[PDB]
Amino acid sequence: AMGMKSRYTTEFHELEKIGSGEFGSVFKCVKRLDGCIYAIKRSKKPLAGSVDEQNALREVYAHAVLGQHSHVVRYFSAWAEDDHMLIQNEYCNGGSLADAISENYRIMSYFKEAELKDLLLQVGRGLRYIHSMSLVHMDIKPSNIFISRTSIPNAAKVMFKIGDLGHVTRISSPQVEEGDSRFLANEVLQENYTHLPKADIFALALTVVCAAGAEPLPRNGDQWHEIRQGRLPRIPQVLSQEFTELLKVMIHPDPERRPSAMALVKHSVLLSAS
Ligand SMILES: CC(=O)N1c2cnc(Nc3ccc(N4CCN(C)CC4)cc3)nc2N(C)C[C@H]1c1c(Cl)cccc1Cl
Ligand SMILES: [Cl-]
Ligand SMILES: [Cl-]
Ligand SMILES: [Cl-]
Ligand SMILES: [Cl-]
Ligand SMILES: [Cl-]
Ligand SMILES: [Cl-]
Ligand SMILES: [Cl-]
Ligand SMILES: [Cl-]
Ligand code: NA
Numbered sequence: 001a002m003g004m005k006s007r008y009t010t011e012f013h014e015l016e017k018i019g020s021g022e023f024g025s026v027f028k029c030v031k032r033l034d035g036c037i038y039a040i041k042r043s044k045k046p047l048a049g050s051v052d053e054q055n056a057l058r059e060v061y062a063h064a065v066l067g068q069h070s071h072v073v074r075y076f077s078a079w080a081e082d083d084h085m086l087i088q089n090e091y092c093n094g095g096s097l098a099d100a101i102s103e104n105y106r107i108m109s110y111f112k113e114a115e116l117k118d119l120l121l122q123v124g125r126g127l128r129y130i131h132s133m134s135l136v137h138m139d140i141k142p143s144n145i146f147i148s149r150t151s152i153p154n155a156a157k158v159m160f161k162i163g164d165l166g167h168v169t170r171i172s173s174p175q176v177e178e179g180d181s182r183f184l185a186n187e188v189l190q191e192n193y194t195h196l197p198k199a200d201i202f203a204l205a206l207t208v209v210c211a212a213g214a215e216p217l218p219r220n221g222d223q224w225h226e227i228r229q230g231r232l233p234r235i236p237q238v239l240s241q242e243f244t245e246l247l248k249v250m251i252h253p254d255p256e257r258r259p260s261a262m263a264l265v266k267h268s269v270l271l272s273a274s
Contacts, residue, residue: 001082002042002082002084003081007079007081007086008081008086011033012032013029013030013032014028014029015029015030018039018095019039023043024041024084025041026039026040026041027039027040027042029088037091038076038088038089038091039088039089039091040086040089041086041089042085042086043056043085043086044083044085045083045084045085046085055166056085058169059087059165059166060075060078062135062165063078063087063165065133066129066130066133066165066168069129069130070161071122071125071129071159071160071161071162072129072161072162072163072165073162073163073165074090075088076088076090089163090148092146092147092161093147093148093149094149096142096143096144096145096163097142097143097145097147097160097210097211098142098143099143099147100142100147100211101142101210101211109213110211110212110236110237111211111213112237113237113240113243114272114273115211116208116212117243117270117272117273118273119208119211120273121273121274122159123140123204124204124261124264124265124270125265127197127201127204128262128264130162130261131261134172135170135171136169136170136196136197136199137165137179137203138168138169138177138179138188138196138200139166139180139183140162140183140203140204141183141203141206143164144163145162145163145207146160146161146162146163147159147160171196171197173193174193176191176193176196179203180203181219181220181224182217182218183206183207184199185198185199185228185255186228186253187199187255195255195256197260198255199255201250201255201258201260201264202251202255202258205232205248205250205251206227206233206251209232209233209247212235212236212237213236214235214236215234227251228253230248230252231251232247242269243269246259246270
């Protein structure tokens with residue numbers, strides 16, 4: 001809890017809690033001076049000078065570098081007070097893709113093919129930017145993709161944004177902190193980091209597979225290995241042959257054969273979503 005003269009309490013009116021972690025939570029808040037809603041994550045402050053601090057500050061640094069892109073979550077501010085570290089990001093009104101999937105699942109639905117191409121194109125724009133900046137996300141998965149649904153009053157919209165930049169690292173990085181095992185490419189687990197950007201492409205394909213209604217992905221075991229041999233998880237729908245082949249080459253066992261994020265966004269299959 002924060003003090004009543006904290007920056008957090010004075011400058012923001014806290015609304016709804018919107019997420020929870022081990023040592024923190026996320027609130028939907030209004031900033032009093034501008035009237036706009038933000039997501040503010042407040043976590044226990046990492047020990048100053050520690051490796052945990054290093055990892056926390058890397059996230060903020062990634063945000064500061066990447067957050068200008070239209071398909072990466074905007075960052076506004078970060079600070080520390082009351083033994084908490086705070087990050088104020090844009091609030092995304094549709095929650096994460098994991099939340100949108102779970103809502104879909106509850107009503108016996110899924111993203112249909114046109115929605116999946118839209119997802120894939122938009123997050124791939126996101127990755128193209130990240131990779132152009134010599135960075136890799138390393139943790140692409142539905143819970144780290146955020147959704148904003150907007151209405152434009154005076155046109156003469158659903159946006160997917162990459163968030164949770166806590167695993168972002170540079171392309172040539174010799175150590176890599178692995179992301180979610182359900183989405184982790186085999187080469188990264190083996191500690192081959194020659195083609196890091198293609199680990200994000202792999203994770204994105206599996207993320208679109210989850211959007212498309214696949215069952216829970218394995219964290220380990222024979223099914224996990226089967227996926228890493230290049231076999232797509234089963235989905236409860238029949239997608240076009242061309243779109244299925246895009247997804248499948250995105251999980252190719254050789255990273256070099258997976259599309260770049262650039263090739264991805266230029267792909268003829270996704271021209272229908274442009
Ligand atoms: C983009 C973004 O950076 N952040 C974000 C934005 N917007 C939102 N919006 C939302 C709406 C609604 C919901 N749901 C959850 C499911 N229930 C059922 C309804 C509401 C959940 C989240 N939640 C967010 N949280 C959960 C994470 C947060 C964050 C911050 Cl502030 C700092 C560092 C890393 C991250 Cl990932
Ligand atoms: Cl402020
Ligand atoms: Cl919550
Ligand atoms: Cl402090
Ligand atoms: Cl682009
Ligand atoms: Cl997830
Ligand atoms: Cl390998
Ligand atoms: Cl899953
Ligand atoms: Cl179908
Ligand atoms: Na942005």
